[PDB]
Write a protein that binds this DNA or RNA. Structure first.
Lengths: 28, 1072, 394, 50, 49, 22, 50
RNA sequence: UGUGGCAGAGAGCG
RNA sequence: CGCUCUCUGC
């Protein structure tokens, strides 16, 4: 169970990236 | 015309005996055929009453079988006790189920044996699991088994339904057969002596499980049902509350692609706007913990469906969530105890660490809002403030529940809780004293009532005296009638539809703005609804008192103020065995005239006060805030584009800025969606909560076996439109079993479709769902004329109460507060109006309705009566119909779906014509005369009375107006103008406008002002008869729509209506 | 934020159409124009604030004495007054002129207010922007029942296949100054082509923008009120003259509407990278004239400005589409030129073009033929290769 | 053809009838239907030929 | 008057179809008053117009 | 004839004078 | 050869048969199939040779 | 004869 | 506008 659960936690991070956030993050 | 076949099969299945015989009774509006029906009846009874075979005559009288209309079927069958098991053993070959007592927090909320919790029957109570419905579990099981039996030979997808429901019903019947079936008494209760050796919560589990398994059409439905039915047998406190909670986060994950909007002027207007879903990261961790609780409780398949759905976050698979969100509330109620249910609310944490900068602004905003509400009437010296006492005494709701009391009307004793009857009692004995407000203290604490609703807590209800209402009435009525011209309240956003209650989730949404939405239902015991709230209103009253010069108004305002003073310290009667507890609760709840608007005010002030702290860290322009009592959402727009971190930080700031006021909250921020108790939007598409238990109720009403079938059908229709679909045949089976009546132990009668589906006071359902039906034939006319003759009935209890001294005294005392020159025109009128709310008293309604049913049965048994010409609606429709002409048409698809959970035919209509462009005809007695009386008085004389009064001379009319406080000059002007002939015509126009048949559940949503529907309705214009052409166009629209619903295809129409029939119909228009 | 000189950024390739898909690639241009239209619909503002509907309709039913209960009876001056069409027209006009998509009209002749609000439509919007048969029918109808009956002229004798539209051949017949100059404006209303910031643009007249066309319209309509209708009875004239007084009373709001459309149109035009050509199309967009009448009758003191974020969103979308378009063009041109210079004779240059159309995420390759692909290839042969690819090939 | 019903809508919105009058214009609407226009169109040509 | 062009169309159509079905005639066609007549309701003309 | 009642005559008579004095 | 349906879907919109009052709204696009193209290709050559 | 409401809107009875 | 039912914020 929990291996697949942690991968489920992970795939909702890489996905749905906003553009302003990565801009300010590259600067920061 | 199919119900009756299922009725025949049900009768054949349930009784099955040689002794079980079946006896139709028919009717026809045609003399000859009717006399042949009488004959048929006679000969059938005789033959039955002579031990002769009945099967021989059934061929001979074929004419009755072809042209006559059925009423009912009788049944002579003996006791045959215990037949449920004798049928049920076969459908119970699986293994029964074991509870798990260590799941729920409490002890008695586990589904353990009754005797382990209630050894004595004197301390037994079925109220913690009462289904509260006059139909038995055995009835439900019989219906299920009959359905299963008839669907025993089909081979299709239907068979996949049969296998699924058979496995579920096996699980259920295995659980019941382990012990047996409880047997109902005459009252449909279940006594101690049957439940003594069985689980306490087996019945509700059974009923709820039947309701769920009867709503299974797919594999995922089967998964949900097996996964809830097996856990709802033990878990009864952390199931609907659990699974219904994550949904509030899920709505913040659905990208909008296509939208519906609403104007300030309240009109839908679609938009192709796309909006992303800027969800923060930590709410996913919250959601995972919620799923961890979900799995920890014992749920395996339904976390799997919610986790694998997030891989795509698509909106096509999303209704499943909504479906799941409705499968949680069809498990039953958590009917716990009065004590522990109050103590769910009566836990308080009041602290000397909050701000003072917050409470002072809060108090002020409440003050300012009150002044905005009350500036105009307090200043212009309105009659309703002057005469607040009389206003409250007329508007006494006669279910109001203040303080059960022993009465006596002549030679009886009554234990009424109704405040109108209490007032009648107190007027006589000199105790009526509305200026002296009673305290609420140690010497007189308050009772309680219990509001249950699944998936949430049991909420509490104050049960106050009758002085508080009288004080609060006038001011709260002006508050409501003001603020429904104004934003921020449900009174402004409410008639039926989308374009209403919300109507601005979806204007101010894009990738610049966000929306913070928040449930505030626990905020009744909070530290910000105590002292500052009351003192703010008190301060506003001081300002308003100094903003007027008349004295009755100052008295009313000072009484409302003193009410808030006394309510600031308030104790609460709750027994527990022998001793009585009274708890300090100096805060707000319902059971008051004030609670809705005042809670809305306080939440508005609170959110306005909080929102001036986010400004210390963000730049935004507040576009909209909305408050409807215990919920709230605010949209806000930024100088830039939105990010994940700003939503997260805003949410944390909201949580902590409420924490600074000692206020708990689950802060929820999003971009596309919200969640509140009754509804929510995702991807620019409105869904709804379908959580209305059918086979289990909240409380015990007062209605009959009959009307509960109608309520159950209404709830079925609602839940079906909402999304939760139950098998209609089951519903019809329940309707026949609930309209079945026992004339003896062995005689039983069963009505037919043509008695239950006819527009009357006995209507239960409709022959085709989502369509009220009218009558073009002779036969509906015949029985409608018959039943309208019978609706008017008497109540001897009401007759003797209205003939006592207190009722006469009450009318006189109401009278004497006004002028003293009318005695046979209004005193009878006020008595006749009070009669309309004496019927709330249950024995009056029961006497009348049992009498009404007896009158029905004494013409169901024997043949029928012509009823002597009394005109109704179907008489008119019979004459309008034969000058129509149909032709096949073809409308295209050009309108957007925004209510996906609807059936595809209703949606097809929405997908071919528009959703609502809303209209108004009258906002209540608008025409000429009641808006004068409502300016100089509050009295609401019935339009019957006005239709008579205007027909009288202009002298006693003048006396009558002067008697209502009006001067002589305006009466003189009214008589000189010659408006009485006009208000005859306006009143009769209002009579035709009383036809409420536009809003039953499917006509609720359709746009009849459409151009596409209209180009089909080719009715030429004549003029100078507006009512007729109005109703003709309307009725033609209803024809087209009903054909569309029931058959899908479209049609046009044409009515070259002759002028002769316009005039012949015109006199029946403005009557009845 | 201040950005350092250590930073960098990449520029898109915003080189205009090397292919001229508005020259006989109509099946692709229909899809492209539809795509840009539907994109523009998602950023045109919703008419957030209005004047009411029930009260406005009551003013219509208290001015026009079709009474009582003409709420439900709906054939004359009415039947499409709602919000749900006014927004459609507001959205459609702007999105069509931006995407340059022709729009056809589905109306009824019994409804004369639709004919009246079509005047405002055919003035504020050019006539070469519509499709021919629809506005021919509408102009013909207007002429036959508002204009020529206002001077005792004959109805008309119009011919189906006539090179000129009725307003042109009517401009010279009737002798009234107001209507003549109004019709002159209408007939000679057209777009103004102009290249700005590199991109061609179809711009309005600069008289429509600062709304004064509506004053010529009001002049004409007031004149027609002042005439008599000798050929026709009193009730008909009464109905018509009330129908146009109902527009006279909404004059200033119409002017404001015109200025607002022009402003939002140019504001959204600003966020365009690909030149916007004026060419008729296969598929159209329906426009009920009741959806103009609604807009012209449900409107007032409520301005709507596109948010900057909608503009930035729309601009970045168009940039990305244009950059993808040019880059994939350069890919295809590189492989074609290289294949032709390496003597590859067995190689069928189709799958490359199929890939080219697949990477443009708007087409349906299931229903596009080989001939369009080969013509597109024939055009792609004649394009210079970009510097990178050319140097790598040499 | 134009349908009978839409033509009657146009004619009735033109004529502006009165349901409380003995008018000299309801009799215009007698027999406007198709299957008669066909009959007349057929009869004229058939009779002039024969 | 609001069916002007349509009546022109109708007239051209009647004349054409008449003289075309006249081309398919072989026996010379005489102008004579016959015994019995064909009824003709002008409502059936109105309809056509 | 819409709203030719008393209680507004008084309201206007009172409102005008009290405004012009205040 | 070229896919049949690919040509049908585009011809339907290049000619726009969903806007005309004609008696051939589903009859222009009949006989476009293979089993007729190659049949014609055989018929032509065979007739010119023979 | 033993008792569970305030107001909003939608139906059914006056 | 007076009462029962549907849910609604309670």
């Amino acid at each position: 169970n929990k291996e697949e659960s942690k991968q489920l936690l992970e795939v909702l991070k890489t996905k749905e990236e906003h553009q302003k956030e990565v801009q300010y993050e590259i600067l920061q | 015309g199919k119900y009756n076949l299922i009725l025949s099969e049900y009768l054949s299945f349930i009784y099955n005996s040689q002794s079980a015989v079946q006896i139709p009774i028919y009717y026809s509006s045609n003399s000859e055929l009717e006399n042949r029906c009488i004959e048929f009846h006679s000969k059938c009874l005789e033959n039955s009453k002579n031990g002769l075979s009945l099967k021989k005559l059934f061929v001979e009288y074929s004419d009755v079988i072809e042209n006559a209309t059925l009423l009912s079927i009788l049944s002579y069958s003996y006791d045959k006790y215990n037949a449920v098991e004798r049928k049920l053993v076969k459908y119970a070959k699986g293994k029964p189920l074991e509870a798990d007592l260590t799941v729920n927090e409490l002890d008695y909320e586990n589904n353990k044996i009754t005797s382990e919790l209630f050894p004595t029957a004197e301390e037994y109570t079925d109220l913690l699991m009462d289904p509260a419905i006059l139909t038995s579990l055995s009835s439900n099981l019989n219906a299920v088994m009959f359905w299963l039996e008839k669907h025993e030979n089909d081979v299709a997808e239907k068979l996949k339904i049969y296998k699924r429901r058979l496995d579920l019903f096996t699980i259920v019947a295995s659980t019941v057969n382990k012990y047996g079936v409880p047997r109902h008494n005459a009252k449909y209760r279940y006594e101690y002596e049957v439940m003594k050796d069985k689980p306490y919560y087996l019945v509700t589990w059974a009923n709820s499980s039947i309701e769920m398994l009867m709503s299974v059409f797919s594999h995922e439905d089967y998964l949900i049902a097996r996964e809830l039915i097996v856990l709802s047998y033990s878990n009864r406190s952390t199931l609907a509350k659990l699974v219904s909670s994550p949904m509030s986060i899920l709505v913040a994950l659905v990208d909008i692609n296509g939208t519906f909007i609403t104007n300030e002027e309240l009109e839908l207007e679609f938009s192709n706007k796309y909006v992303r879903a800027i969800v923060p990261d930590q709410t996913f961790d919250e959601l995972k913990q919620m799923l961890d609780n979900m799995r920890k409780a014992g749920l395996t398949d339904i976390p799997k469906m919610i986790q694998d759905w997030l891989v795509d976050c698509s909106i096509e698979k999303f209704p499943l969530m909504a479906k799941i969100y409705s499968w949680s509330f069809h498990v039953g109620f958590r009917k716990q105890k009065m004590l522990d249910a109050a103590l769910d609310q009566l836990k308080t944490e009041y602290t000397e660490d909050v701000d003072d900068e917050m409470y002072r602004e809060y108090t002020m905003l409440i003050r300012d809002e009150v002044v905005k509400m009350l500036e105009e009437p307090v200043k212009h010296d309105d009659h309703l403030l002057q005469d607040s006492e009389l206003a409250g005494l007329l508007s006494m709701s006669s279910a109001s529940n203040g303080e059960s009391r022993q009465l006596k009307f002549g030679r009886k004793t009554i234990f009424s809780t109704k405040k109108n009857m209490h007032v009648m009692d107190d007027m006589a004995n000199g105790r009526y004293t509305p200026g002296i407000i009673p305290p609420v203290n140690v010497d007189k604490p308050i009772p309680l009532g219990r509001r249950d609703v699944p998936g949430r807590r049991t909420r509490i209800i104050f049960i106050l005296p009758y002085e508080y209402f009288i004080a609060q009435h006038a001011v709260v009525e002006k508050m409501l009638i003001y603020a429904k011209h104004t934003r921020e309240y449900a009174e402004f956003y409410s008639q039926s539809n989308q374009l209403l209650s919300y109507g601005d989730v979806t204007r101010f949404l894009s990738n610049n703005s966000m929306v913070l939405y928040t449930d505030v239902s626990q905020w009744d015991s909070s530290q910000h609804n105590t002292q500052p709230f009351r003192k703010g209103i008190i301060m506003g009253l001081d300002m308003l008192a100094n903003m007027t010069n008349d004295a009755r108004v100052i008295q009313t305002l000072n009484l409302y103020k003193q009410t808030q003073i006394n309510l600031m310290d308030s104790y609460v009667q709750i027994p527990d065995g022998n001793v009585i507890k009274k708890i300090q609760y100096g805060a707000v709840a319902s059971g008051e005239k004030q609670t809705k608007a005042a809670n809305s005010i306080a939440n508005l002030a609170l959110i306005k006060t909080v929102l001036s702290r986010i400004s210390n860290k963000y730049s935004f322009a507040t576009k909209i805030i909305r408050v409807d009592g215990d919920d709230n959402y605010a949209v806000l727009q930024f100088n830039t584009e939105v990010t994940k971190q700003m939503v997260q930080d805003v949410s944390n700031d909201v949580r902590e800025t409420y924490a600074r006021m000692n206020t708990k909250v689950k802060a929820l921020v999003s971009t596309v969606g919200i969640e509140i108790a009754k509804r929510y939007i995702a991807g620019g598409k409105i869904f709804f909560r379908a959580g209305i238990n059918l086979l289990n109720n909240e409380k015990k009403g007062q209605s009959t076996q009959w009307d509960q079938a109608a309520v159950l059908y209404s709830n079925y229709i609602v839940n079906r439109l909402r999304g939760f679909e139950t098998d209609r045949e089951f519903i019809l089976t329940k309707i026949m079993q609930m309209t079945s009546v026992a004339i003896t132990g062995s005689l039983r009668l069963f009505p037919s479709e043509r008695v239950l589906t006819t527009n009357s006071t006995f209507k239960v359902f409709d022959s085709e769902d989502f369509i009220i039906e009218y009558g073009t034939t002779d036969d509906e006319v015949y029985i409608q004329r018959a039943f309208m003759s019978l609706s008017s009935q008497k109540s001897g209890i009401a007759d003797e109460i209205a003939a006592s001294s207190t009722f006469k005294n009450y009318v006189s005392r109401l009278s004497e507060q006004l002028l003293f020159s009318k005695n046979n025109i209004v005193s009878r009128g006020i008595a006749l109006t009070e009669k309309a709310k004496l019927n709330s008293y249950a024995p009056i309604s029961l006497e009348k309705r049992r009498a009404q049913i007896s009158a029905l049965l004494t013409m169901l048994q024997k043949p029928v009566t012509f009823k002597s010409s009394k005109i109704t609606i179907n008489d008119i429709l019979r004459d309008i119909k034969p000058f129509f002409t149909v032709n096949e048409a073809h409308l295209p698809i050009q309108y957007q779906k925004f209510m996906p959970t609807l059936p595809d035919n209703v949606q097809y209509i929405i997908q071919c014509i528009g959703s609502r462009t809303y209209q108004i005809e009258d906002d209540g007695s608008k025409s000429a005369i009641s808006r004068l009386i409502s300016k100089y008085s509050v009295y609401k004389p019935s339009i019957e009375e006005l239709y008579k009064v205007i027909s009288l001379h202009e002298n006693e009319i003048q006396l009558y107006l002067i008697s209502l406080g009006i001067p002589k000059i305006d009466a003189d002007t009214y008589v000189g103008s010659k408006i009485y002939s006009q208000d005859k015509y306006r009143i009769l126009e209002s009579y035709v406008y009383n036809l409420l048949s536009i809003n039953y559940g499917c006509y609720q949503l359709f746009d009849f002002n459409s151009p596409d529907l209209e180009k089909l309705i080719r009715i030429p214009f004549k003029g100078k008869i507006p009512a007729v052409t109005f109703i003709l166009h309307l009725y033609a629209k209803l024809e087209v729509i009903n054909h569309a619903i029931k058959n899908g295809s479209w049609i046009s129409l044409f009515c070259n209506y002759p002028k002769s029939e316009m005039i012949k119909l015109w006199k029946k228009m403005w009557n009845i | 934020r201040n950005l350092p000189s250590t930073a960098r950024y990449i520029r898109p390739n915003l080189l205009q159409d090397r292919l001229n898909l508005h020259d006989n690639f109509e099946s692709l241009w229909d899809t492209i124009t539809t795509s840009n239209y539907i994109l523009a619909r998602s950023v045109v503002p919703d008419l957030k604030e209005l004047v009411s509907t029930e009260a406005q309709i009551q003013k219509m039913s208290q001015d026009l004495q079709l009474e009582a209960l003409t709420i439900q009876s709906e054939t004359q001056f009415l039947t499409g007054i709602n919000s749900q069409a006014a927004n459609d027209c507001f959205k459609t006009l702007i999105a069509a002129m931006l995407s340059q998509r022709t729009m056809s009209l589905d109306f009824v002749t019994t409804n004369y207010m639709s004919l009246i609000s079509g005047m405002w439509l055919l003035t504020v919007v050019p006539n070469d922007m519509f499709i021919r048969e629809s506005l021919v029918a509408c102009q013909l109808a207007i002429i036959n029942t508002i204009i020529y009956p206002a001077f005792g002229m004959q109805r008309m004798h119009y011919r189906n296949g006539d090179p000129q539209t009725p307003f042109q051949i009517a401009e010279q017949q009737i002798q009234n100054f107001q209507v003549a100059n109004w019709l002159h404006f209408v007939n000679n209303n057209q777009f103004r082509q102009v290249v700005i910031d590199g991109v061609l643009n179809q711009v309005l007249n600069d008289n429509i923008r600062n709304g004064h066309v509506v004053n010529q319209l009001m002049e004409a309509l007031m004149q027609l009120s002042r005439q008599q209708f000798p050929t026709m009875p009193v009730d008909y004239k009464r109905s018509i003259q009330r129908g146009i007084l109902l527009l006279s009373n909404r004059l200033g709001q119409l002017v404001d509407l015109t200025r607002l459309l022009a402003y939002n149109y140019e504001t959204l035009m600003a966020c365009i990278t690909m030149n916007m050509q004026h060419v008729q199309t296969l598929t159209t967009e329906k426009l009920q004239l009741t959806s103009v009448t609604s807009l012209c009758m449900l409107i007032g003191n409520a301005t709507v400005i596109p948010s900057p974020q909608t503009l930035f969103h729309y601009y970045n979308v168009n940039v990305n589409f244009h950059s993808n378009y040019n880059e994939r063009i350069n890919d295809a041109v590189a492989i074609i030129t290289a294949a032709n210079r390496l003597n590859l004779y067995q190689k069928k240059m189709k799958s490359i073009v199929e890939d080219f159309l697949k990477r443009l995420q708007i087409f349906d390759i299931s229903r596009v033929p080989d001939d369009q692909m080969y013509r597109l290839r024939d055009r792609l042969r004649l394009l210079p290769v970009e510097i990178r690819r050319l140097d790598i090939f040499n």
